[PDB]
Design a binder for this molecule. Structure first.
Ligand code: NA
Length: 200
DNA sequence: GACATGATTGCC
DNA sequence: GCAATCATGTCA
């Protein structure tokens, strides 16, 4: 409640938003009233129509990815490999959004451990875009919900950033190389480290 | 309607 | 190194 980041926070372009997300806390309120909490430590930006690595490239817009084209803070959750979910948050700009890739589990660990069993060390709980969705019971029903106005999920105010190439982009093209992935330097909770990028 | 494919994960 | 597994994007 009271701590929830509002509409204003999300209304920022993809890069600033993705960097702004680091440190913030994603909260998931379960039916039992329990709340799962994770500190965002890795995010990845998609800039829209011009971004050849995005679902929205070339203005591609369908009922599936409509979330990216809706008001900032709107979620875009999709199924990948017909088996996993990926959670994205719309940012300022049509077709622009930010993908959450890893969280530092803070509360509800045991429930997360159960959710990701279908014994896992804490490091394997939310160290991935699909892992975190699983650990927080996030699925397709969350698609197009508003992070600023939803009863089951929201972001709470925070309390060195590394900019690196994105994960899952392939090895061809200018867009695959851009430093559009951001994570907390030194965090053992990040999904994929880039030692080279870490060398400033 | 048909057909190729995935912003992953995890076992071989 | 590679299979799992199916809704979506495209073409028809
Ligand atoms: Na957007």
């Amino acid at each position: 409640h009271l701590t929830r980041l509002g509409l204003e926070f999300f209304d920022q372009p993809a890069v600033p938003l993705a960097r702004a997300f680091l440190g913030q806390v994603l909260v998931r309120r379960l039916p039992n009233g329990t709340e799962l909490r994770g500190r965002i430590v890795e995010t990845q930006a998609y800039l829209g129509p011009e971004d050849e690595a995005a679902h929205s490239r070339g203005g591609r817009q369908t009922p599936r990815n409509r979330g990216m084209f809706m008001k900032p803070g709107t979620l875009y959750v999709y199924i990948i490999y017909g088996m996993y979910f990926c959670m994205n948050i719309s940012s300022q700009g049509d077709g622009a959004c930010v993908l959450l890739r890893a969280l530092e589990p803070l509360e509800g660990l045991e429930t997360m451990r159960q959710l990701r069993s279908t014994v896992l060390k804490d490091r394997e709980l939310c160290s991935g875009p699909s892992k975190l969705c699983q650990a927080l019971a996030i699925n397709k029903s969350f698609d197009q919900r508003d992070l600023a106005q939803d009863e089951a999920v929201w972001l709470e105010r925070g309390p060195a950033v590394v900019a690196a190439a994105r994960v899952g982009v392939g090895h061809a093209g200018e867009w695959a190389r851009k430093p559009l992935r951001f994570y907390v330097r030194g965090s053992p909770w990040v999904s994929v480290v880039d030692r080279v990028a870490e060398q400033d």
